[PDB]
């Protein structure tokens, strides 16, 4: 389960764009201590919820 700081950073990124690119995702992964793959799936899943 995501920590609060991880979810906060993920939502801040999503609020800038629903389609963050791989460079943005990788920078997030490094900063927040998750893999880029986990973060990528989170964005896919949040886009599916939005649609
Ligand atoms: Cl991947």
Method: X-ray
Q: Are 47 and 20 in contact (CB under 8 A)?
A: no
Distance (angstroms) between ligand 1 centre and the Cα of 39 equals: 9
C-alpha 5: how far from chain center:
12
CATH class assigned to 1-51: mainly alpha
Distance (angstroms) between ligand 1 centre and the Cα of 37 equals: 4
Q: Delimit the domains of the chain by residue range.
A: 1-51
Distance (angstroms) between ligand 1 centre and the Cα of 13 equals: 18
Collapse the DSSP code of 1 into the 3-class scheme (helix H, G, I; strand E, B; otherwise coil) and give the result.
coil
H and E: helices and strands count for the chain = 3, 0
Q: Are 33 and 47 in contact (CB under 8 A)?
A: no
Q: How far, in Å, CA of 35 to CA of 41, rounded? A: 10
Collapse the DSSP code of 25 into the 3-class scheme (helix H, G, I; strand E, B; otherwise coil) and give the result.
helix
Q: How far, in Å, CA of 6 to CA of 20, rounded? A: 16
Q: Give the angle 8-47-32 at the CA atoms, nearest 5°.
A: 30
Residues 6+ apart with CB under 8 A from 34: 2, 6, 28
Distance (angstroms) between ligand 1 centre and the Cα of 5 equals: 22
Distance (angstroms) between ligand 1 centre and the Cα of 11 equals: 20
């Amino acid at each position: 389960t995501f920590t609060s700081f991880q979810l906060e950073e993920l939502e801040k990124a999503f609020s800038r764009t629903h389609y963050p690119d791989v460079f943005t995702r990788e920078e997030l992964a490094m900063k927040i201590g998750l893999t880029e793959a986990r973060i990528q799936v989170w964005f896919q899943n949040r886009r599916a919820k939005w649609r």
